[PDB]
Design a protein around this nucleic acid. Structure first.
Length: 34
DNA sequence: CATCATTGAGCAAATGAGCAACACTATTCGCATAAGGTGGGAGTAGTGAGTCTTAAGTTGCAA
């Protein structure tokens, strides 16, 4: 039922939609790790 | 016997096309910008005929 979605944009949205938006303090958390 | 035309032969003078080597500058290339800006959009709508290929539905049929 993955409808042969030959647009690469569509599936690219399907992968980038996995990760949700991080707040700005989580950037302090991650750049802390950096 | 003399001499010259007449056939080779090569050269200086001149010149046209370069060459390398430095030296200088035009152009190009590559990097930066701090409050904040966290899911596209046009996508045609009035073909039809055929032929190959799956895909699924049905259906004898035998252990």
């Amino acid at each position: 039922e993955i409808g042969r979605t030959t647009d690469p944009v569509r599936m690219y949205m399907r992968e980038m939609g996995t990760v949700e938006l991080l707040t700005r303090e989580g950037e302090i958390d991650i750049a802390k790790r950096i």
